[PDB]
Amino acid sequence: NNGLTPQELEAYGISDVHDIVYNPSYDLLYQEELDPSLTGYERGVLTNLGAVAVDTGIFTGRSPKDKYIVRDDTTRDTFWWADKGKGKNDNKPLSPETWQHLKGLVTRQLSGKRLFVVDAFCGANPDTRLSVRFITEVAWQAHFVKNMFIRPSDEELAGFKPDFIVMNGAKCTNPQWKEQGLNSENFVAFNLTERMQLIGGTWYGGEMKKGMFSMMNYLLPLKGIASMHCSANVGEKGDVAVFFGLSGTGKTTLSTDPKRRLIGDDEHGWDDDGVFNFEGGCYAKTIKLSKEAEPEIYNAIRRDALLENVTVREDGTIDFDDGSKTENTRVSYPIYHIDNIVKPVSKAGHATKVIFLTADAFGVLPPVSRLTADQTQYHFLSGFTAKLAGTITEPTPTFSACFGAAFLSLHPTQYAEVLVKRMQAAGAQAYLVNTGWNGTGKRISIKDTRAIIDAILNGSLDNAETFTLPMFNLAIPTELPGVDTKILDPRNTYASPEQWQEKAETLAKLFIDNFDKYTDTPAGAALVAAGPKL
Ligand SMILES: Nc1ncnc2c1ncn2[C@@H]1O[C@H](COP(=O)(O)OP(=O)(O)OP(=O)(O)O)[C@@H](O)[C@H]1O
Ligand SMILES: [Mg+2]
Ligand SMILES: [Mn+2]
């Protein structure tokens, strides 16, 4: 029935829907979250910055072990399954039967309640975008999807017909999990035949964000459109730059550059016209957030922005440095909270600069180096980054294909293939930047990192004289405008170049061991030459 009547939700299996809050405004959401009635995790608090902060509960990040995709006649022969001959991933198969069981738990949990329904888009271009309908019973959750996805116009809602439905049943869990062979009572399931996503047990909003991203990572490459885990911005001359990288590497902090127009900060596609954003907002990290170091992001934290897991003092002030509940404190905000952005549609032309961000805890890789075409692919499939696990003692490596393995629905080489095709057609140049550590035991400052990005974007790096770094065979500059020459050669940051050597051999070996699983095909076996060598 036209409009968005309760009888329309009955088709989804939801019953006794009393009140339906359809596409709530930011003001409605504001009063909903501050309602003194609210108890538990539904309760939001007001901070001295005018933004409301919520607690996501026990889950303060994604839960890949609870992710499942229904294996049926639609997904069977196309999906990159975790139990298939292909690589290690989180795409665990699920039977249609267990799906229906999980669906029953969700629809029942959402029956006889006041439901928030947010209609939106995933993808800036109408020809490849997904019309998604989110259903929840928690206000701050509908707020999160309002911030993160593309907010439709009144005229667009008129002819709005969803392609995908996501039902968030955070308050319910699956008690029959042991009998079904699942990881736990919690669940994040997808069914491509019904085009739905179910969430149970976990309150974390990121599951809906990354969940839709995973779906885009499935549909687009099959159409020849690159789907990427990267930030992106444009210059006044129209030069587009994409920044790939794993979590915590700098895609958001570095693309948020006042001198350039922000396209997006995390999920983009690349078609015949160019690079386009999937989202309608940004999701910044807030631990130890410095207003001096990252002023644009700090000023975005105001009414309508949603703080997550941050610790708010009695006086309402936020302690950004406190990571007691989690180091993964975040804040989402609609994109317009950033001044210099592409308006009204988040898209631009083909990218000409392709930057790979990595936080090397081993202190081996150089701050910046220009990559050859074969090294571009080698490093893309490698997806290296290292944290520093050890209360930061003993660096621990992470190799995540395409810089976002956790969101891949297809085999990694399928993404590399479509990426290489787009880069070629545009004569794009690739670079590798170490936003991490060096022999000093301290992470490179944001100031130094921004200077390096400018040199890459302004061309002064392309004109610089370079020499080859041994083992990894990376072309590194002799000098660069704005940055200290001493840090350009990673070996200079150690007391003796012998220290670098030893650590470099360790890292090189890890890379070689990791890439070995790709050498099954001639193309990948050919790429081994583009990797490190002892
Ligand atoms: N030199 C540096 N370069 C970049 N970021 C730095 C640097 N030094 C410190 N940081 C901090 O590291 C983090 C980089 O975070 P960022 O939010 O950009 O990750 P991201 O790539 O967007 O990951 P995700 O996909 O999870 O959003 C921020 O907390 C930033 O303040
Ligand atoms: Mg980010
Ligand atoms: Mn991300």
Coordinates of C-alpha atoms and ligand atoms in Angstrom, one line a residue:
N1 CA 0.0 0.0 0.0
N2 CA 1.3 3.4 -1.1
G3 CA 3.2 5.6 1.3
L4 CA 4.9 3.3 3.8
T5 CA 2.1 1.8 5.8
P6 CA 2.5 -0.9 8.4
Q7 CA 0.9 -3.3 5.9
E8 CA 4.0 -2.8 3.7
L9 CA 6.4 -4.0 6.5
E10 CA 4.2 -7.1 6.9
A11 CA 5.6 -8.3 3.6
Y12 CA 9.0 -8.4 5.3
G13 CA 7.4 -10.6 7.9
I14 CA 7.0 -7.9 10.6
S15 CA 3.7 -7.8 12.5
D16 CA 1.8 -5.5 14.8
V17 CA 3.7 -2.4 13.7
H18 CA 2.2 0.4 15.7
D19 CA 4.3 3.5 15.0
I20 CA 6.6 4.0 12.0
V21 CA 9.1 6.9 12.1
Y22 CA 9.9 7.2 8.4
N23 CA 13.0 9.2 7.4
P24 CA 13.4 11.1 10.6
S25 CA 14.9 14.6 10.4
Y26 CA 18.0 15.5 12.3
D27 CA 15.9 17.4 14.9
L28 CA 13.6 14.5 15.5
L29 CA 16.6 12.2 15.9
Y30 CA 18.1 14.7 18.3
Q31 CA 15.1 14.7 20.7
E32 CA 14.7 10.9 20.4
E33 CA 18.3 10.2 21.6
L34 CA 18.1 12.6 24.5
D35 CA 14.7 11.3 25.8
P36 CA 15.3 10.9 29.6
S37 CA 13.1 7.8 29.4
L38 CA 15.8 5.8 27.5
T39 CA 17.8 3.2 29.4
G40 CA 20.9 1.1 28.5
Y41 CA 22.7 1.4 25.2
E42 CA 19.8 3.3 23.6
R43 CA 20.7 6.2 25.8
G44 CA 22.6 9.1 24.3
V45 CA 24.3 12.0 26.2
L46 CA 25.0 15.6 25.2
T47 CA 28.6 16.8 25.0
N48 CA 29.9 20.4 25.3
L49 CA 30.5 20.3 21.5
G50 CA 26.7 20.0 20.9
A51 CA 27.1 16.5 19.6
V52 CA 25.4 13.5 21.2
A53 CA 27.5 10.5 22.3
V54 CA 26.3 6.9 22.5
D55 CA 27.8 3.5 23.6
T56 CA 27.7 0.7 21.1
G57 CA 27.6 -1.9 23.9
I58 CA 29.8 -5.0 24.1
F59 CA 30.7 -4.8 20.4
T60 CA 32.9 -1.8 19.8
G61 CA 34.0 -3.0 16.3
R62 CA 33.0 -5.5 13.6
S63 CA 32.7 -9.2 14.3
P64 CA 34.0 -11.0 11.2
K65 CA 33.6 -14.4 12.9
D66 CA 29.8 -13.9 12.9
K67 CA 29.5 -12.9 9.2
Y68 CA 27.7 -15.4 7.0
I69 CA 26.4 -15.4 3.4
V70 CA 23.7 -17.7 2.3
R71 CA 24.8 -20.2 -0.3
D72 CA 22.1 -20.8 -2.9
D73 CA 21.8 -20.9 -6.7
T74 CA 22.6 -17.1 -6.9
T75 CA 25.8 -16.9 -4.8
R76 CA 27.2 -20.4 -5.1
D77 CA 29.4 -20.2 -8.3
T78 CA 30.3 -16.5 -7.9
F79 CA 31.2 -15.8 -4.3
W80 CA 34.6 -16.1 -2.8
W81 CA 33.8 -18.7 -0.1
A82 CA 35.8 -19.2 3.0
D83 CA 35.6 -23.0 2.6
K84 CA 36.6 -23.0 -1.1
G85 CA 40.0 -23.6 -2.6
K86 CA 40.5 -19.8 -2.7
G87 CA 42.0 -17.6 0.0
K88 CA 41.3 -17.1 3.7
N89 CA 38.2 -14.9 4.2
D90 CA 35.1 -14.4 6.3
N91 CA 32.6 -15.3 3.7
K92 CA 31.2 -18.3 5.6
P93 CA 28.4 -20.3 3.9
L94 CA 25.0 -20.5 5.5
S95 CA 22.0 -22.7 4.6
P96 CA 18.7 -21.1 3.5
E97 CA 17.1 -23.1 6.4
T98 CA 19.2 -21.5 9.1
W99 CA 18.6 -18.2 7.3
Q100 CA 14.8 -18.5 7.7
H101 CA 15.4 -19.3 11.4
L102 CA 17.5 -16.2 11.9
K103 CA 15.0 -14.1 9.9
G104 CA 12.3 -15.3 12.3
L105 CA 14.2 -14.1 15.3
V106 CA 14.7 -10.6 13.7
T107 CA 11.2 -10.0 12.4
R108 CA 9.7 -11.2 15.7
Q109 CA 12.0 -8.9 17.6
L110 CA 10.8 -6.0 15.5
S111 CA 7.1 -6.9 15.7
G112 CA 4.8 -4.8 17.9
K113 CA 7.3 -1.9 18.2
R114 CA 7.9 1.6 17.1
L115 CA 10.2 1.2 14.1
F116 CA 12.6 3.7 12.6
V117 CA 12.7 3.3 8.8
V118 CA 15.4 5.1 6.8
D119 CA 15.4 5.0 3.0
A120 CA 18.7 5.9 1.3
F121 CA 21.2 5.3 -1.4
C122 CA 24.5 3.5 -1.6
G123 CA 26.4 5.0 -4.5
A124 CA 26.3 8.5 -6.0
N125 CA 25.4 7.4 -9.5
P126 CA 21.8 6.4 -10.2
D127 CA 22.8 3.7 -12.7
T128 CA 24.8 1.6 -10.1
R129 CA 23.4 2.8 -6.8
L130 CA 21.5 0.6 -4.4
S131 CA 18.2 1.8 -2.9
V132 CA 18.5 0.5 0.7
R133 CA 15.8 0.4 3.4
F134 CA 17.1 0.2 6.9
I135 CA 14.8 -0.9 9.8
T136 CA 15.7 -0.5 13.5
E137 CA 14.2 0.1 16.9
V138 CA 17.0 2.2 18.3
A139 CA 17.1 5.9 17.3
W140 CA 20.9 6.4 17.2
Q141 CA 21.1 3.5 14.8
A142 CA 18.8 5.2 12.3
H143 CA 20.9 8.4 12.9
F144 CA 24.1 6.4 11.9
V145 CA 22.6 5.3 8.6
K146 CA 21.3 8.9 8.0
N147 CA 24.8 10.2 8.3
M148 CA 26.6 7.5 6.5
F149 CA 24.4 6.9 3.4
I150 CA 23.1 9.2 0.7
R151 CA 20.1 11.1 1.9
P152 CA 17.4 11.2 -0.8
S153 CA 15.4 14.2 -1.8
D154 CA 11.6 14.5 -1.3
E155 CA 11.1 13.9 -5.0
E156 CA 13.3 10.8 -4.8
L157 CA 11.4 9.2 -1.9
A158 CA 8.3 9.5 -4.0
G159 CA 9.5 6.8 -6.4
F160 CA 11.6 5.0 -3.9
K161 CA 11.7 1.2 -4.3
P162 CA 14.4 -0.6 -2.3
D163 CA 16.8 -3.1 -3.9
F164 CA 18.2 -4.2 -0.5
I165 CA 16.7 -4.4 3.0
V166 CA 18.7 -4.4 6.2
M167 CA 16.9 -5.4 9.4
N168 CA 18.8 -4.6 12.5
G169 CA 17.8 -6.8 15.4
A170 CA 20.6 -5.8 17.8
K171 CA 18.5 -6.7 20.9
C172 CA 18.0 -10.3 19.9
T173 CA 20.4 -13.2 19.9
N174 CA 20.3 -16.8 18.5
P175 CA 20.0 -19.4 21.3
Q176 CA 20.2 -22.4 18.9
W177 CA 23.6 -21.4 17.5
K178 CA 25.5 -24.5 18.8
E179 CA 23.1 -26.8 17.1
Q180 CA 23.5 -24.9 13.9
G181 CA 27.3 -24.7 13.8
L182 CA 27.6 -21.0 14.0
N183 CA 30.3 -19.0 15.8
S184 CA 28.1 -17.6 18.5
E185 CA 24.6 -16.3 19.4
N186 CA 25.3 -13.1 17.5
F187 CA 25.0 -12.9 13.7
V188 CA 25.5 -10.7 10.6
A189 CA 23.9 -12.5 7.7
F190 CA 23.3 -11.8 4.0
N191 CA 21.0 -13.4 1.5
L192 CA 21.4 -12.3 -2.1
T193 CA 18.3 -14.1 -3.4
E194 CA 16.1 -12.1 -1.0
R195 CA 18.5 -9.2 -1.0
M196 CA 18.5 -8.7 2.8
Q197 CA 20.9 -8.3 5.7
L198 CA 20.1 -9.4 9.2
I199 CA 21.9 -8.3 12.3
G200 CA 21.5 -9.8 15.7
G201 CA 23.3 -9.3 19.0
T202 CA 25.8 -6.7 17.9
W203 CA 24.8 -3.0 18.2
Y204 CA 27.8 -1.7 16.3
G205 CA 26.7 0.5 13.5
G206 CA 29.7 -0.3 11.4
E207 CA 28.2 -3.6 10.5
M208 CA 25.6 -1.9 8.3
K209 CA 28.1 0.4 6.7
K210 CA 30.7 -2.3 5.9
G211 CA 27.8 -4.7 5.1
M212 CA 26.5 -2.6 2.2
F213 CA 30.1 -2.0 1.1
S214 CA 30.6 -5.8 0.9
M215 CA 27.5 -6.0 -1.3
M216 CA 28.9 -3.2 -3.6
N217 CA 32.2 -5.2 -3.7
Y218 CA 30.1 -8.0 -5.2
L219 CA 27.8 -6.3 -7.7
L220 CA 30.2 -3.7 -9.2
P221 CA 33.3 -5.7 -10.2
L222 CA 30.9 -8.1 -12.1
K223 CA 30.0 -5.0 -14.2
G224 CA 33.6 -3.9 -14.8
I225 CA 33.4 -1.1 -12.1
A226 CA 36.1 -1.0 -9.5
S227 CA 34.9 -1.0 -5.9
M228 CA 37.5 0.4 -3.6
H229 CA 38.4 0.8 0.1
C230 CA 39.9 4.3 -0.4
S231 CA 39.4 8.0 0.4
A232 CA 39.4 10.5 -2.5
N233 CA 39.8 14.2 -3.3
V234 CA 40.2 16.6 -6.2
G235 CA 42.3 19.7 -6.8
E236 CA 41.2 23.0 -8.4
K237 CA 42.7 21.8 -11.7
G238 CA 40.5 18.7 -11.5
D239 CA 43.2 16.1 -10.6
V240 CA 41.7 13.2 -8.6
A241 CA 43.7 11.3 -6.0
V242 CA 42.6 8.0 -4.4
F243 CA 44.1 6.8 -1.1
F244 CA 44.0 3.0 -0.3
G245 CA 44.9 1.6 3.0
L246 CA 43.8 -0.6 5.9
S247 CA 42.2 0.7 9.1
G248 CA 44.1 3.3 11.0
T249 CA 46.5 4.1 8.1
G250 CA 45.3 7.6 7.3
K251 CA 42.7 7.5 4.5
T252 CA 40.4 9.8 6.5
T253 CA 42.9 12.1 8.2
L254 CA 45.0 12.6 5.0
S255 CA 42.2 13.1 2.5
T256 CA 40.7 15.8 4.8
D257 CA 42.9 18.4 3.3
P258 CA 41.6 22.1 3.3
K259 CA 43.5 22.7 0.0
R260 CA 41.6 20.0 -1.8
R261 CA 37.9 19.2 -2.3
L262 CA 36.9 16.0 -0.4
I263 CA 35.0 13.4 -2.5
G264 CA 34.8 10.7 0.1
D265 CA 36.8 9.1 2.8
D266 CA 36.3 5.3 2.7
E267 CA 34.3 3.7 -0.1
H268 CA 34.4 4.6 -3.8
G269 CA 33.7 3.1 -7.2
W270 CA 35.4 3.8 -10.5
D271 CA 33.4 3.6 -13.8
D272 CA 33.8 5.1 -17.3
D273 CA 33.1 8.6 -16.0
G274 CA 35.4 8.5 -13.0
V275 CA 35.6 8.1 -9.3
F276 CA 32.3 8.3 -7.2
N277 CA 31.5 8.1 -3.5
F278 CA 29.2 5.4 -2.1
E279 CA 28.4 7.2 1.1
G280 CA 26.9 10.5 2.4
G281 CA 29.0 11.0 5.4
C282 CA 32.4 10.4 7.1
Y283 CA 33.4 8.1 10.0
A284 CA 36.5 9.5 11.7
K285 CA 38.7 8.0 14.4
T286 CA 38.9 10.1 17.6
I287 CA 41.5 8.6 19.9
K288 CA 44.0 11.2 20.9
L289 CA 42.3 13.6 18.4
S290 CA 44.2 16.9 18.3
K291 CA 42.3 20.0 17.2
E292 CA 45.6 21.5 16.1
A293 CA 46.6 18.5 14.0
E294 CA 43.2 17.7 12.5
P295 CA 41.0 20.9 12.8
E296 CA 38.6 20.1 10.0
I297 CA 37.6 16.8 11.6
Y298 CA 37.4 18.4 15.0
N299 CA 35.1 21.1 13.8
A300 CA 32.8 18.5 12.3
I301 CA 32.0 17.3 15.8
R302 CA 28.9 19.4 16.5
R303 CA 25.1 18.8 16.5
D304 CA 24.1 16.0 14.1
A305 CA 27.4 14.3 14.4
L306 CA 27.3 11.1 16.4
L307 CA 30.1 10.2 18.8
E308 CA 30.8 6.6 19.6
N309 CA 32.3 5.0 22.7
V310 CA 34.1 8.2 23.7
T311 CA 34.4 9.0 27.4
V312 CA 32.4 12.0 28.5
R313 CA 33.3 13.6 31.8
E314 CA 30.7 14.8 34.3
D315 CA 30.9 18.3 33.0
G316 CA 30.0 17.1 29.6
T317 CA 33.5 17.5 28.3
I318 CA 35.0 14.8 26.1
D319 CA 38.4 13.1 27.0
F320 CA 39.5 12.1 23.4
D321 CA 42.7 10.5 24.8
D322 CA 40.8 8.0 27.0
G323 CA 40.7 4.6 25.2
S324 CA 39.5 2.6 28.2
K325 CA 36.4 1.2 26.5
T326 CA 38.1 1.0 23.1
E327 CA 40.8 2.5 20.9
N328 CA 38.1 2.3 18.2
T329 CA 36.3 5.5 19.3
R330 CA 34.6 7.0 16.3
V331 CA 32.2 9.8 15.2
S332 CA 30.1 9.9 12.1
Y333 CA 28.9 13.1 10.4
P334 CA 27.1 14.0 7.2
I335 CA 29.6 15.0 4.5
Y336 CA 28.6 18.7 4.5
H337 CA 30.1 19.0 8.0
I338 CA 33.4 19.4 6.1
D339 CA 33.6 22.8 4.4
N340 CA 35.6 22.1 1.2
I341 CA 33.8 19.2 -0.4
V342 CA 32.4 18.3 -3.9
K343 CA 28.7 19.4 -4.1
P344 CA 26.0 18.5 -4.8
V345 CA 27.0 15.0 -6.0
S346 CA 30.1 13.3 -4.6
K347 CA 31.9 12.3 -7.8
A348 CA 34.8 13.5 -9.9
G349 CA 37.0 12.5 -12.9
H350 CA 39.3 9.5 -13.3
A351 CA 42.1 9.3 -10.7
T352 CA 45.7 10.1 -11.8
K353 CA 47.4 9.6 -8.5
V354 CA 47.0 6.3 -6.6
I355 CA 48.4 6.3 -3.1
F356 CA 48.8 3.2 -1.0
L357 CA 48.9 4.0 2.7
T358 CA 50.6 1.6 5.2
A359 CA 51.6 2.0 8.8
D360 CA 54.8 0.0 9.0
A361 CA 55.5 -0.8 12.6
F362 CA 58.7 -2.7 11.6
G363 CA 60.3 0.7 10.7
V364 CA 61.6 -0.6 7.4
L365 CA 59.7 1.0 4.5
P366 CA 60.5 4.6 3.4
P367 CA 58.1 7.5 4.0
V368 CA 57.4 7.7 0.2
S369 CA 58.4 5.8 -2.9
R370 CA 57.2 5.8 -6.5
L371 CA 55.9 2.4 -7.6
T372 CA 56.3 0.6 -11.0
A373 CA 53.3 -1.0 -12.6
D374 CA 54.1 -4.5 -11.4
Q375 CA 54.9 -3.4 -7.8
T376 CA 51.5 -1.6 -7.8
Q377 CA 49.7 -5.0 -8.3
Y378 CA 52.1 -6.8 -6.0
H379 CA 51.4 -4.4 -3.1
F380 CA 47.7 -4.2 -3.9
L381 CA 47.3 -7.9 -3.5
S382 CA 49.6 -7.9 -0.5
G383 CA 47.7 -5.3 1.5
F384 CA 50.4 -4.9 4.2
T385 CA 50.3 -2.9 7.5
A386 CA 51.6 -3.6 10.9
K387 CA 50.1 -2.4 14.2
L388 CA 52.4 -2.7 17.3
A389 CA 50.8 -5.2 19.6
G390 CA 52.8 -5.4 22.9
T391 CA 52.0 -3.3 26.0
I392 CA 53.8 -0.8 21.6
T393 CA 56.3 -3.6 21.7
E394 CA 56.9 -6.3 19.0
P395 CA 55.4 -5.2 15.7
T396 CA 52.8 -7.6 14.3
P397 CA 52.1 -7.8 10.5
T398 CA 48.7 -7.9 8.8
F399 CA 48.3 -8.8 5.1
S400 CA 44.9 -8.0 3.8
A401 CA 44.3 -8.4 0.1
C402 CA 43.3 -5.2 -1.8
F403 CA 43.7 -3.3 1.4
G404 CA 40.3 -4.5 2.6
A405 CA 40.1 -8.3 2.6
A406 CA 37.3 -8.3 5.2
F407 CA 34.9 -6.7 2.7
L408 CA 35.7 -8.7 -0.4
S409 CA 32.9 -10.8 -1.9
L410 CA 34.9 -11.8 -4.9
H411 CA 38.4 -13.2 -5.3
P412 CA 41.2 -10.5 -4.7
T413 CA 42.6 -10.8 -8.3
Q414 CA 39.1 -9.8 -9.6
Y415 CA 39.5 -6.5 -7.9
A416 CA 43.1 -6.0 -9.0
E417 CA 42.1 -6.7 -12.6
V418 CA 39.4 -4.0 -12.7
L419 CA 41.7 -1.5 -10.9
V420 CA 44.6 -2.0 -13.3
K421 CA 42.3 -1.5 -16.3
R422 CA 41.1 1.9 -14.9
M423 CA 44.5 3.0 -13.9
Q424 CA 45.8 2.3 -17.4
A425 CA 43.1 4.1 -19.3
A426 CA 43.9 7.2 -17.2
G427 CA 47.7 6.9 -17.1
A428 CA 47.6 6.9 -13.3
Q429 CA 50.8 6.7 -11.2
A430 CA 51.0 4.7 -8.0
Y431 CA 52.9 5.6 -4.8
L432 CA 53.5 3.9 -1.5
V433 CA 53.6 6.0 1.7
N434 CA 54.7 4.8 5.2
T435 CA 52.4 6.7 7.6
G436 CA 53.9 4.4 10.3
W437 CA 57.2 4.2 12.1
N438 CA 60.9 4.2 11.5
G439 CA 64.1 3.5 13.4
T440 CA 63.2 6.2 15.9
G441 CA 60.5 4.2 17.6
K442 CA 58.0 7.0 17.1
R443 CA 55.4 7.3 14.4
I444 CA 56.0 10.0 11.7
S445 CA 54.1 13.2 12.5
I446 CA 51.0 14.2 10.7
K447 CA 52.7 17.4 9.7
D448 CA 55.5 15.5 7.9
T449 CA 53.0 13.1 6.3
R450 CA 50.9 16.0 4.9
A451 CA 54.0 17.6 3.4
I452 CA 54.8 14.3 1.6
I453 CA 51.3 14.1 0.2
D454 CA 51.5 17.6 -1.2
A455 CA 54.8 16.7 -2.9
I456 CA 53.1 13.8 -4.6
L457 CA 50.1 15.8 -5.5
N458 CA 52.0 18.8 -6.8
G459 CA 54.3 16.8 -9.0
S460 CA 57.6 17.7 -7.3
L461 CA 58.0 14.0 -6.4
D462 CA 57.7 12.9 -10.1
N463 CA 60.5 15.3 -11.0
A464 CA 62.7 14.4 -8.1
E465 CA 65.9 12.4 -8.5
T466 CA 65.5 8.9 -7.1
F467 CA 67.7 6.0 -6.1
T468 CA 66.8 2.3 -5.4
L469 CA 66.2 1.1 -1.9
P470 CA 67.8 -2.5 -1.6
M471 CA 65.8 -5.7 -1.1
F472 CA 62.4 -4.0 -1.7
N473 CA 63.7 -2.2 -4.8
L474 CA 61.8 0.9 -4.2
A475 CA 62.6 4.2 -6.0
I476 CA 63.0 6.8 -3.2
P477 CA 63.6 10.5 -3.6
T478 CA 67.0 12.1 -2.8
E479 CA 65.2 15.2 -1.4
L480 CA 61.7 16.7 -1.2
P481 CA 60.3 20.2 -0.6
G482 CA 58.9 20.7 2.9
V483 CA 60.3 17.5 4.4
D484 CA 63.5 16.5 6.2
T485 CA 65.9 14.6 3.9
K486 CA 67.1 12.5 6.7
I487 CA 63.8 10.6 7.0
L488 CA 63.5 9.8 3.2
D489 CA 66.1 7.0 3.5
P490 CA 64.8 4.6 6.3
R491 CA 68.3 3.6 7.0
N492 CA 69.3 7.0 8.3
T493 CA 66.8 6.7 11.2
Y494 CA 68.8 3.8 12.7
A495 CA 72.1 4.0 14.6
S496 CA 73.7 1.6 12.2
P497 CA 72.3 0.6 8.8
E498 CA 72.8 -3.0 10.0
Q499 CA 69.8 -2.6 12.3
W500 CA 67.7 -1.7 9.2
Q501 CA 69.1 -4.6 7.3
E502 CA 68.2 -7.3 9.8
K503 CA 64.6 -6.0 10.2
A504 CA 64.3 -5.6 6.5
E505 CA 65.1 -9.2 5.9
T506 CA 62.5 -10.3 8.4
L507 CA 59.8 -8.1 6.7
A508 CA 60.9 -9.2 3.2
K509 CA 60.5 -12.9 4.2
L510 CA 56.9 -12.2 5.5
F511 CA 56.0 -10.6 2.2
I512 CA 57.4 -13.5 0.2
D513 CA 55.7 -16.1 2.5
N514 CA 52.4 -14.2 2.1
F515 CA 52.4 -13.7 -1.7
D516 CA 53.1 -17.4 -2.3
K517 CA 49.3 -18.2 -2.2
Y518 CA 48.9 -16.0 -5.3
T519 CA 51.5 -17.7 -7.4
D520 CA 49.0 -20.4 -8.4
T521 CA 48.3 -18.5 -11.6
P522 CA 51.0 -17.4 -14.2
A523 CA 50.1 -13.8 -13.7
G524 CA 50.7 -13.9 -10.0
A525 CA 53.7 -16.1 -10.3
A526 CA 55.1 -13.5 -12.8
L527 CA 54.5 -10.8 -10.1
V528 CA 56.8 -12.4 -7.6
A529 CA 59.6 -10.6 -9.4
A530 CA 58.0 -7.3 -8.4
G531 CA 58.3 -8.3 -4.8
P532 CA 61.2 -8.2 -2.2
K533 CA 64.3 -10.3 -2.8
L534 CA 67.0 -11.3 -0.3
Ligands
LIG1 N1 51.6 10.4 10.4 C1 50.3 10.1 10.4 N2 49.6 9.9 9.3 C2 48.3 9.6 9.3 N3 47.6 9.4 10.4 C3 48.3 9.6 11.5 C4 49.6 9.9 11.6 N4 50.0 10.0 12.9 C5 49.0 9.7 13.6 N5 47.9 9.5 12.9 C6 46.5 8.9 13.4 O1 46.3 7.6 12.9 C7 44.9 7.4 12.5 C8 44.7 7.4 11.1 O2 43.4 7.1 10.9 P1 42.3 7.0 9.8 O3 41.0 7.3 10.6 O4 42.6 7.8 8.6 O5 42.2 5.5 9.4 P2 41.5 5.1 8.0 O6 42.5 4.8 7.0 O7 40.4 6.1 7.7 O8 40.8 3.6 8.5 P3 39.2 3.2 8.4 O9 39.0 2.5 7.1 O10 39.1 2.3 9.6 O11 38.4 4.4 8.5 C9 44.2 8.7 13.2 O12 44.0 8.4 14.5 C10 45.3 9.7 13.1 O13 45.2 10.7 14.0
MG2 MG 38.4 6.4 7.8
MN3 MN 37.3 1.6 6.2

